[PDB]
């Protein structure tokens, strides 16, 4: 009867694989597996993550083929992936990220081996692209109903676990159910590689290609945009002619939500492109 | 920091570890080592305990204890005796004044609160010695 | 039972189709591979058998597998091109022995040579020194001949073969009407 504080380690591997699984997150019920190695009790790491072929039966304990499972696992053993399965993941599109009866039953059946059995549910469908943040799931014992619910230390991370702030599902399904915190890990190799690759993704091959293009497009394309900018600015100025009257009348309080400033500032920011590319053209002409 | 102006190492350690309670809560037990008692010392000899009573220029009622709910202009002398010195504010060290009629006085004039000894001016009998406690929760 | 890996090399040249000796003995030694792999199947079915040729470009027809079912189908289309190659033919097998599944299986590689060796004694004794260094069992089998049977090949085998006790054996088959099956089944390496 001992319980410690566990934290699920998530890398970019499983994340991206769950993004591809997000593209695979069609309403048809799907299956997934997670692999890794357990160094100790209170830490869990996942590395190898793959998908599973779809079926008409949907998610079930019968849907998982044991011989095919062990086969693929053996194929992973002969290769450079010597990690045991740490659990299984799936998708629950549109009816919520919670777990049904069959799901918690096959979870109960799959947790017979591993005491941990990390449960991850991804649902990109109603999830905005603003945040990819996901919440891992856990299974409480049925014999702990007499004593306290969660005997876990390090309560400082519950505020980080407060991200699902929804006022329904949380304390609604809180009975015999709970969750676990999620953190990531990054080294220098992944950092430098991904940063350089992304910067290059926002850049060009020789990087000198599409610059001079816009530099020479300043006299064609941008000019029209500058004319339109002058049109909108004048459309503001005609009201700005009406403004000093109000400034000569009330001056108390602001009934106009329009700032009229920062937008024109941004217009100037778009106007600075000519100045910034001027030196560029100078460098091109010079040498 | 200390009275001499130097900072206490176990105090800084204690309070920083106290701020380290975020990661590990049981580590907050090191706060007890950062506790610094505020008082004076009227002790002259190791086996001899005298009694020194001074006076203050402020109100004793203002320096008293804020007794909570039950739920079942100048003081003649300080409340500190048998030296059991109570809590003392560093700002109250400037307002204390030694009695001119006091029998026992140190060789060094007392100005700011700190660690000092007591010197016998009379060098005679009747040192007013008090007994020692008995067995219990402590040693 | 016995845990070991089996690597068989077949000669894809046109010297096997000659009219003096057996009428395209490739099929005969194919049947030999069949009966010895079925023998190994009867003894220890968990053993895997790989297949590759001695030609210039090394191309694996079938990866090592306990099931010879598809192997029997892959025994066809020998692609009769090239002549012979030795060094990279060794390096494509002995160095590829690390790709096996079971790590408890012993390393055993044989060869069928129907063509004269183009490599000098230097490469021979060097590669033999390498195989002796990494300690891999090698069985030399030569079907058909032009020049003298064993000249430098004797010293080659002697230098290649270490651990005299229960070590490797040399198989030398002369011309004759009899098949190669019962002839290569004579040593202890077969069955
Ligand atoms: Zn559903």
Characterize the bridge pairing of strands C4-10 and C106-113. Answer: parallel
The position carrying tokens 């450079």 is A80
Report residue C56 as tokens.
């210039």
Cα–Cα distance between A100 and B104 in angstroms, integer? 85
Q: Count of H helices and E strands in chain A?
A: 9, 8
- Measured in Å, residue A93 CA sits from the centre of ligand 1 at 7
Q: What are phi and psi of B55, to 5 degrees?
A: -125, 160
List C-alpha distances in Å: C67 to A73, C53, C75: 19, 20, 14
* Percent of chain C as helix, strand, coil, to the nearest 5: 35, 15, 50
Characterize the bridge pairing of strands A118-121 and A84-90. Answer: parallel
Residues of A in contact with B22 (CB under 8 A): 156
**Contact of A121 with A90, CB cutoff 8 Å:** yes
Nearest to B36 by CA among B92, B108, B137, B113: B113
For CA atoms B5, B10, B13, B14, give the dihedral sign. Answer: negative
Nearest CA in chain A to B24: A154
Resolution of the structure in the document, Å = 6.8
Is A90 annotated in some ligand binding site? yes
Helix (H) or strand (E) holding A34: strand A31-36
**Cβ-based neighbour number of residue C164 at 10 Å:** 7
Nearest to A35 by CA among A69, A89, A85, A88: A85
3-state SS class at B29: helix
Question: Cβ–Cβ of B22/A153 closer than 8 Å?
Answer: no
**Cβ-based neighbour number of residue A30 at 10 Å:** 23
* Percent of chain A as helix, strand, coil, to the nearest 5: 40, 15, 45
Helix (H) or strand (E) holding C6: strand C4-10
**Contact of B35 with B8, CB cutoff 8 Å:** no
B14: CB partners within 8 A, 6+ apart: B30, B31, B32, B33, B34, B35
**Contact of C24 with C17, CB cutoff 8 Å:** yes
Is A149 annotated in some ligand binding site? no
**Cβ-based neighbour number of residue B46 at 10 Å:** 6
Find residue A32's DSSP bridge partners.
A51, A89
The position carrying tokens 């089944």 is C185
Between helix A221-240 and helix A262-286 the angle, nearest 10°, is: 150
**Contact of A136 with A90, CB cutoff 8 Å:** no
Report residue A274 as tokens.
């000519």
The position carrying tokens 């058998």 is C49
Alpha helices in C19-114 (DSSP H): 26-43, 69-74, 87-91
Burial of C64 from C-beta contacts in 10 A (0-12 / 13-18 / 19+)? buried
Report residue A133 as tokens.
């943040």
Helix (H) or strand (E) holding C156: helix C152-160
Cα–Cα distance between A141 and A118 in angstroms, integer? 14
> For testing the chain A interface, which of B19, B20, B21, B25 should be mutated: the one with the most A CBs within 10 Å?
B25
Residues of B in contact with A5 (CB under 8 A): none
Nearest CA in chain B to A156: B22
Residues A106-142: b if buried by 16+ CB within 10 A, e if exposed: bbeebbeeeebbbbbbbbbeeeeeeeeebebbebeee
Cα–Cα distance between B30 and B13 in angstroms, integer? 8
**Cβ-based neighbour number of residue A218 at 10 Å:** 16
Quote the minimal CA–CA distance from A29 to chain B in Å: 40
How far is Cα of residue A23 from the mean position of the Cα atoms in its chain? 14
**Cβ-based neighbour number of residue A177 at 10 Å:** 17
The C-alpha angle C69, C80, C160, rounded to 5 degrees, equals 80
DSSP category for residue B25: G
List C-alpha distances in Å: A86 to A36, A38, A74, A242, A266: 6, 8, 15, 69, 51
C53: CB partners within 8 A, 6+ apart: C9, C10, C11, C12, C59, C78, C79, C82
Which residues of chain B come before a gap where C and the next N are over 2.5 Å apart? 72, 83
């Amino acid at each position: 009867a001992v319980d410690t504080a566990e934290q699920v380690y998530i890398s970019s591997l499983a994340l991206l694989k769950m993004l591809k699984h997000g593209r695979a997150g069609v309403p048809m019920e799907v299956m997934g597996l997670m692999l890794g190695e357990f160094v100790d009790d209170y830490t869990v790491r996942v590395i190898d993550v793959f998908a599973m072929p779809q079926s008409g039966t949907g998610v079930s304990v019968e849907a998982v083929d044991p011989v095919f499972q062990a086969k693929m696992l053996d194929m992973l053993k002969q290769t450079g992936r010597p990690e045991m399965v740490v659990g299984w993941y799936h998708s629950h599109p549109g009816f919520g990220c919670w777990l049904s009866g069959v799901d918690i039953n096959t979870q109960q059946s799959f947790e017979a081996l591993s005491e941990r059995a990390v449960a991850v549910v991804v649902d990109p469908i109603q999830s905005v692209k603003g945040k990819v943040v996901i919440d891992a799931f856990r299974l409480i014992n049925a014999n702990m109903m007499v004593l306290g619910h969660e005997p876990r230390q390090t309560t400082s991370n519950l505020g980080h676990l407060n991200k699902p702030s929804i006022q329904a599902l949380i304390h609604g399904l809180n009975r015999h159910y709970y969750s676990i915190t999620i953190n990531y890990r990054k080294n220098e190799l992944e950092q430098k590689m991904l940063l350089n690759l992304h910067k290059k993704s926002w850049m060009e091959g020789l990087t000198l290609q599409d610059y001079s293009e816009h530099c020479k497009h300043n006299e064609s394309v941008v000019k029209e945009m500058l004319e339109l900018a002058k049109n909108y600015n004048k459309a503001v100025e005609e009201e700005d002619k009406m403004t000093p009257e109000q400034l000569a009348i009330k001056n108390v309080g602001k009934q106009d939500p329009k700032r009229h400033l920062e937008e024109h500032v941004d217009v100037l920011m778009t106007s600075n492109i000519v100045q910034c590319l001027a030196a560029m053209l100078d460098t091109v002409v010079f040498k | 920091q200390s009275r001499t102006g130097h900072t206490h190492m176990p105090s800084v350690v204690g309070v920083l570890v106290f701020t380290q309670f975020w990661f590990w809560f049981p580590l907050s037990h090191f706060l007890s080592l950062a506790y610094t008692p505020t008082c004076v010392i009227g002790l002259n000899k190791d086996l001899k305990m005298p009694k020194v009573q001074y006076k203050s220029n402020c109100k004793p009622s203002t320096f008293a204890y804020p007794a909570p709910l039950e739920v079942p202009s100048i003081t003649a002398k300080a409340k500190k005796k048998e030296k059991n010195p109570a809590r003392v504010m560093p700002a109250q060290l400037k307002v204390l004044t030694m009695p001119e009629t006091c029998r026992y006085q140190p060789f060094k004039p007392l100005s700011i609160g700190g660690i000092i000894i007591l010197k016998d001016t009379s060098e005679d009998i009747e040192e007013l010695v008090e007994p020692v406690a008995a067995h219990g929760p402590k040693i | 039972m016995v845990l070991e890996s089996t690597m068989v090399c077949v000669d894809n040249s046109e010297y096997m189709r000659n009219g003096d000796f057996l009428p395209t003995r490739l099929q005969a030694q194919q049947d030999a591979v069949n009966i010895v792999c079925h023998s190994k199947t009867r003894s220890n079915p968990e053993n895997n058998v790989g297949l590759i040729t001695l030609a210039n470009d090394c191309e694996v027809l079938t990866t090592l597998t306990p099931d010879t079912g598809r192997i029997l189908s892959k025994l066809h289309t020998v692609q009769p091109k090239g002549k012979i190659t030795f060094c990279t033919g060794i390096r494509v097998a002995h160095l590829a022995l690390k790709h096996r599944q079971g790590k408890n299986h012993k390393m055993r590689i044989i060869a069928f040579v129907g063509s004269p060796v183009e490599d000098n004694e230097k490469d021979l004794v060097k590669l033999a020194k390498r195989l002796k260094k990494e300690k891999v069992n090698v069985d030399i089998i030569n079907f058909g001949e032009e020049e003298v049977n064993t000249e430098k090949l004797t010293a080659f085998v002697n230098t290649l073969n270490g651990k005299d006790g229960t070590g490797s054996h040399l198989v030398t088959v002369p011309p004759g009407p009899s098949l190669a099956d019962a002839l290569i089944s004579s040593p202890i390496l077969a069955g």
